Amino acid sequence: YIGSSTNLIMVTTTTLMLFAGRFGLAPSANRKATAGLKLEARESGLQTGDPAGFTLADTLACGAVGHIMGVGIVLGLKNTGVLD
Amino acid sequence: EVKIVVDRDPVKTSFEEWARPGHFSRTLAKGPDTTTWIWNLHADAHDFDSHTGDLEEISRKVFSAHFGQLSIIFLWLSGMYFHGARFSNYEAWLSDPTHIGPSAQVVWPIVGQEILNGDVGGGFRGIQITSGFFQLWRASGITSELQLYCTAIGALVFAALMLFAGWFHYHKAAPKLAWFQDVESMLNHHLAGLLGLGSLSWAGHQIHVSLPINQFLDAGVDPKEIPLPHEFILNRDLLAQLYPSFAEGATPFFTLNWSKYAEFLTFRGGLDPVTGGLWLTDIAHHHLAIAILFLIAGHMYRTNWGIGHGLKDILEAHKGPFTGQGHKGLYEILTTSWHAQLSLNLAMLGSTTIVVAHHMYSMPPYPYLATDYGTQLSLFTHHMWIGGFLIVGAAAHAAIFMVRDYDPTTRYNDLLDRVLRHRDAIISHLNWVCIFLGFHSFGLYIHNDTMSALGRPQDMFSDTAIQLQPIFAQWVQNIHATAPGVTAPGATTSTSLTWGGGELVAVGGKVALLPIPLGTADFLVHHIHAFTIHVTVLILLKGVLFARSSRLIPDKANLGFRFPCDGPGRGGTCQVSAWDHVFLGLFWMYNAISVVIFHFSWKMQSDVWGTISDQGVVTHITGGNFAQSSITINGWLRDFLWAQASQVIQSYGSSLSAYGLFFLGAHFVWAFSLMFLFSGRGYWQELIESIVWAHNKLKVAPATQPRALSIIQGRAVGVTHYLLGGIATTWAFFLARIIAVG
Amino acid sequence: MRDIKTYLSVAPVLSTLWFGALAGLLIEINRLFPDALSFPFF
Amino acid sequence: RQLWFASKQSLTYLDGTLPGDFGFDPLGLSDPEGTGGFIEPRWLAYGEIFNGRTAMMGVVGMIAPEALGKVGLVPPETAIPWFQAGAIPPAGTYQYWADPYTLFVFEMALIGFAEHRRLQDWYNPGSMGKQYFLGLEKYLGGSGDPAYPGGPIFNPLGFGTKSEKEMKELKLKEIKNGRLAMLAFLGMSLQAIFTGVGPFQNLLDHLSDPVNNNILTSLKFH
Numbered sequence A: 001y002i003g004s005s006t007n008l009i010m011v012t013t014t015t016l017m018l019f020a021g022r023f024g025l026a027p028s029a030n031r032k033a034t035a036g037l038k039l040e041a042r043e044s045g046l047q048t049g050d051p052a053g054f055t056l057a058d059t060l061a062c063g064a065v066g067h068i069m070g071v072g073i074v075l076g077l078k079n080t081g082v083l084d
Numbered sequence B: 001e002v003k004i005v006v007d008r009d010p011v012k013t014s015f016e017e018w019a020r021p022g023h024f025s026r027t028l029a030k031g032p033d034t035t036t037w038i039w040n041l042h043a044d045a046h047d048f049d050s051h052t053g054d055l056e057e058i059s060r061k062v063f064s065a066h067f068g069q070l071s072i073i074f075l076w077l078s079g080m081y082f083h084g085a086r087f088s089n090y091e092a093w094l095s096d097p098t099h100i101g102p103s104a105q106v107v108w109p110i111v112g113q114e115i116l117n118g119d120v121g122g123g124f125r126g127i128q129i130t131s132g133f134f135q136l137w138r139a140s141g142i143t144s145e146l147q148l149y150c151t152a153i154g155a156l157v158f159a160a161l162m163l164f165a166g167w168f169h170y171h172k173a174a175p176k177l178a179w180f181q182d183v184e185s186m187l188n189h190h191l192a193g194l195l196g197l198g199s200l201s202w203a204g205h206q207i208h209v210s211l212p213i214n215q216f217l218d219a220g221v222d223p224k225e226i227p228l229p230h231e232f233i234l235n236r237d238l239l240a241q242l243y244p245s246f247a248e249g250a251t252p253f254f255t256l257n258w259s260k261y262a263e264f265l266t267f268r269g270g271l272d273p274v275t276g277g278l279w280l281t282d283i284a285h286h287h288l289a290i291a292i293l294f295l296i297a298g299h300m301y302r303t304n305w306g307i308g309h310g311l312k313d314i315l316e317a318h319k320g321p322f323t324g325q326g327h328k329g330l331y332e333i334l335t336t337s338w339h340a341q342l343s344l345n346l347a348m349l350g351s352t353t354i355v356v357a358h359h360m361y362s363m364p365p366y367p368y369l370a371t372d373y374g375t376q377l378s379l380f381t382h383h384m385w386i387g388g389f390l391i392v393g394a395a396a397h398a399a400i401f402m403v404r405d406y407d408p409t410t411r412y413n414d415l416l417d418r419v420l421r422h423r424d425a426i427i428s429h430l431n432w433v434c435i436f437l438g439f440h441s442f443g444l445y446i447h448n449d450t451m452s453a454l455g456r457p458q459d460m461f462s463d464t465a466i467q468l469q470p471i472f473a474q475w476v477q478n479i480h481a482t483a484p485g486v487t488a489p490g491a492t493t494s495t496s497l498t499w500g501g502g503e504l505v506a507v508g509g510k511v512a513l514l515p516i517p518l519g520t521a522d523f524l525v526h527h528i529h530a531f532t533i534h535v536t537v538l539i540l541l542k543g544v545l546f547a548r549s550s551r552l553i554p555d556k557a558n559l560g561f562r563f564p565c566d567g568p569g570r571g572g573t574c575q576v577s578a579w580d581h582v583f584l585g586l587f588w589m590y591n592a593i594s595v596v597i598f599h600f601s602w603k604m605q606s607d608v609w610g611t612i613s614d615q616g617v618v619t620h621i622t623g624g625n626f627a628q629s630s631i632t633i634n635g636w637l638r639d640f641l642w643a644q645a646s647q648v649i650q651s652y653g654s655s656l657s658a659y660g661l662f663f664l665g666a667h668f669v670w671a672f673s674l675m676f677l678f679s680g681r682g683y684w685q686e687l688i689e690s691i692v693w694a695h696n697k698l699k700v701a702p703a704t705q706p707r708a709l710s711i712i713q714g715r716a717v718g719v720t721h722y723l724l725g726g727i728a729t730t731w732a733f734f735l736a737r738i739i740a741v742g
Numbered sequence C: 001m002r003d004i005k006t007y008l009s010v011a012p013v014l015s016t017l018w019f020g021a022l023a024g025l026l027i028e029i030n031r032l033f034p035d036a037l038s039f040p041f042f
Numbered sequence D: 001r002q003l004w005f006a007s008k009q010s011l012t013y014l015d016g017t018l019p020g021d022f023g024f025d026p027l028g029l030s031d032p033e034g035t036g037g038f039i040e041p042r043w044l045a046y047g048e049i050f051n052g053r054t055a056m057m058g059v060v061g062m063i064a065p066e067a068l069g070k071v072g073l074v075p076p077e078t079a080i081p082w083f084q085a086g087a088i089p090p091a092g093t094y095q096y097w098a099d100p101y102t103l104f105v106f107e108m109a110l111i112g113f114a115e116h117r118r119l120q121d122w123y124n125p126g127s128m129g130k131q132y133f134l135g136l137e138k139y140l141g142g143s144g145d146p147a148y149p150g151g152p153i154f155n156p157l158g159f160g161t162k163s164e165k166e167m168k169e170l171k172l173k174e175i176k177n178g179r180l181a182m183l184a185f186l187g188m189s190l191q192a193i194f195t196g197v198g199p200f201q202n203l204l205d206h207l208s209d210p211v212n213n214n215i216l217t218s219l220k221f222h
């Protein structure tokens, strides 16, 4: 049961969320978005091994949001079988 | 950032003070030169903000007080569970709950009160109860007195633990300011931590213990040989026998094909004919979804990390054209004055209590609850009363905040400033609306009664005469009855049964719910409710808005929150303090609640409750005369107030006789209140003077110089006695009537 | 210790215990003499 | 200080006082603005030491009997998983040289004696070597720090010969072995809660058959 709908959806959503974080397309730990635009990065003080300052919080928050958006886009499975 | 900073051992646990009353107030600690001292002592005990000037100490004090409150609540729960264990017939009640009266209190045979232990069935004698615990204890599958016993023990343990925690946190490790004043993490937790995980763990306890044992009992088994709860989780094969899907461990959940669990988590709706209650599958799905919702909500605000919002970063953005600068700085007001928070929370809590009261009857959650009439009725009216009291308290403390801790120099705001800048317009327009509603909602009753007593029925306000139709309510009911067709396919029936579509649910020859039609009488009663609510709002809002300074007295605030008057000058200035505004509004809130609960009782006993025949003909408890006798006050006397007051008045020499006795004392106090509400003081002062003379003549004049109560305390004792009389009267009436007939 | 003594001598608690004792005496008399209407001693 | 998932609230108090500070604390518990009782950094090092030591002893002991039963000569009368030994009644039991409950309260009283005395030492260091103890008095003074008691009762062979460096090595070893034993214990217990067959038999399994990979099944059963 690997590589199927659930697998591909979850992995692509979480990987694109993490990339949006690490490349500057997500308002992660050291980036707070205003009313409109996003690129307002400011520091929190959570130096970690990541070269772009990614603590063990944003790398978890982005994952949680990716999994939520995945579950939501997949459990609208009204066109790929209501039971898998 | 945010840390665990606290302080060590401010105050020592020394009894040095208990022997010196009023240690907190400098004046009180001097000594009781007169008798008003011992009133003023109790009167300002809990008044923490008048004992210091810094918020740290009063915050510590309220932190300890909350523990005291929780200890009392735990002790009460323990007493309840104990009396259920050692003194109830709970097992016999579980045997068959159709026609066995829940009793959980026996009385000692000493002074002839043996009659109190009336016949309740099931080989038991005891004062019948209406608290409604038994439906809960059957929902949670207690089904054994050992469980009640051990639960009472654990509750006692938690009570002592909370009392300890209290003592320790005030005396030994007192929290500091930057802890209290840090609301971000508090919101974060209480959203995610307390409520969410609470509902989640309860969904646990329901899907793993309640659901199977309840389904077994519905199948019909003596609870003696019903398998114990833990023996439903240890050995899987039982639940396997019940639910095929449930024998698949955790694969169907993690692998996102949740539909397998569809059996025990579903979205049926409606009620369950086996017990009239809710399909426990539905309530489990509810609690679980709510848990998930609270957990995902809890992660809003930045606390220590770099993600999340800040409650200061949310308000100041909102600033519209008309109002101007918006909510700037409001964050500081609601973080630097406890009374503000107390008012806000009391208002929201009263509203939630009211909506709980409403949603209870129309959607009976528990099983075999919509057929124990008295329980449903008593629960609803109790919740209504609690909500009303909470709302009035909210208004009072809002006024107190307005007086003391409001100041534009440092606790500034540009929104409340505008609000206060045009108070007169608000109060004027609300007053006019109150007059309009009063006229067009009570004069209608007066006209109807008069045109009745004048032999002109065809000029009345009813369905058979000049007609007023509540069209919007019937519109909404039609929509709710046709919504499960297209809008909400995932449902099975309407959300409840009270919507104007479907069939009726009846268990044990009695009905529980069925459609509810609305007649012109409902229109009139709804407008009466609207009017009375508007008038109470008028009173309390005027008090709050004018607590600072009125166009009558220019510097009212300087005179303080609670003072009797400003002398008889300028034509008399009686009852100008916001405190007196609350004193007034209390009566009107009482009246609103009273008429609401009377309407509820009559409507239920005239259109829903009752018995069902073998063939299926319904004969309601009162005969269905609402839509034809609620439209005349004389009717209210005749059809409802007089008639349905029989069972309380013949109640002497029976089990219910206690309900009879109160029906007089309730009235009596009720009288008594007038003596304080009408008279003044100077008269009583002179009378006390002459009595002091009569005593002093015999060398008995006490050094605790007698003094007639101060004005404010007179009004307070009056209003308390009056509320007590009214509520006790309606209480005795309700209980006697419903538990006798029903 | 003496502080708790002076506290115990404060009228509320003293009154509560006194009234409890009196009520106990009365209810015990009523138990040992049910309905006790007249004075059937002299 | 090999930084693995650190933060700044960690470095507020984790300034290198514990032997071998690695810098791993996102939450920042023991911030010294207000010293929380039992959140004291001294108490934290004490706790990690004590926990890791207990975990070492437990991971040896819980696994010892059945394991030894494999190709050894401890009889099959005790060839039982640690989680089936009897501590977990829903798993197994055994007829012992007493009854279950009184045995438990008795061992609780003994461990209570030991740890109460140790705690009293913690509050007042050295203060056990005053009162009558039917002997044993001239030993329980310790080596000053309740963290490290020393004493020929607890220093028989004699190490850290004339040194603090040797003590630093031996001791790093202590923290590392404590953490490793913690991991192994937690893993054995999680397998036990999810596998249901026993650790040593799980090794019996994972020696030959690679395809096991029971994270794929995630089967949650007793």
Ligand SMILES: CC1=C[C@H](O)CC(C)(C)[C@H]1/C=C/C(C)=C/C=C/C(C)=C/C=C/C=C(C)/C=C/C=C(C)/C=C/C1=C(C)C[C@H](O)CC1(C)C
Residues within 6 Å of the ligand: D024, D025, D026, D027, D051, D054, D055, D057, D058, D059, D061, D062, D082, D083, D085, D086, D087, D182, D183, D185, D186
């Ligand atoms: C580092 C860090 C950092 C950041 O900041 C955060 C975080 C991440 C959170 C952290 C982490 C941590 C950790 C991992 C920890 C771990 C711990 C443990 C595991 C412990 C154990 C611990 C453990 C323990 C005590 C245990 C012990 C045990 C024992 C003795 C045993 C006993 C027994 C036996 C013999 C057998 C029988 O039949 C039964 C019994 C009775 C069972």
Ligand SMILES: CC1=C(/C=C/C(C)=C/C=C/C(C)=C/C=C/C=C(C)/C=C/C=C(C)/C=C/C2=C(C)CCCC2(C)C)C(C)(C)CCC1
Residues within 6 Å of the ligand: A014, A018, A059, A060, A063, A064, A067, A068, A071, B292
């Ligand atoms: C490249 C690289 C890297 C990276 C990698 C990666 C990419 C990783 C990933 C990672 C990840 C991938 C992570 C994740 C995370 C996730 C999470 C953490 C999730 C969670 C989830 C949850 C918690 C869920 C929840 C829920 C439930 C349970 C039910 C209801 C619904 C919901 C959904 C809410 C490294 C660093 C190595 C190094 C450098 C290089």
Ligand SMILES: CC1=C(/C=C/C(C)=C\C=C\C(C)=C\C=C\C=C(C)/C=C/C=C(C)/C=C/C2=C(C)CCCC2(C)C)C(C)(C)CCC1
Residues within 6 Å of the ligand: B662, B664, B665, B666, B668, B669, B727, B728, B731
């Ligand atoms: C024996 C005696 C006497 C007399 C007495 C009397 C005559 C009394 C009366 C009394 C009256 C003439 C009346 C009364 C009434 C009472 C009441 C009325 C009470 C109540 C209480 C309560 C406690 C209630 C409660 C409640 C309710 C029911 C409602 C709301 C809720 C609650 C639960 C809070 C003499 C002087 C010879 C001597 C001394 C002793």
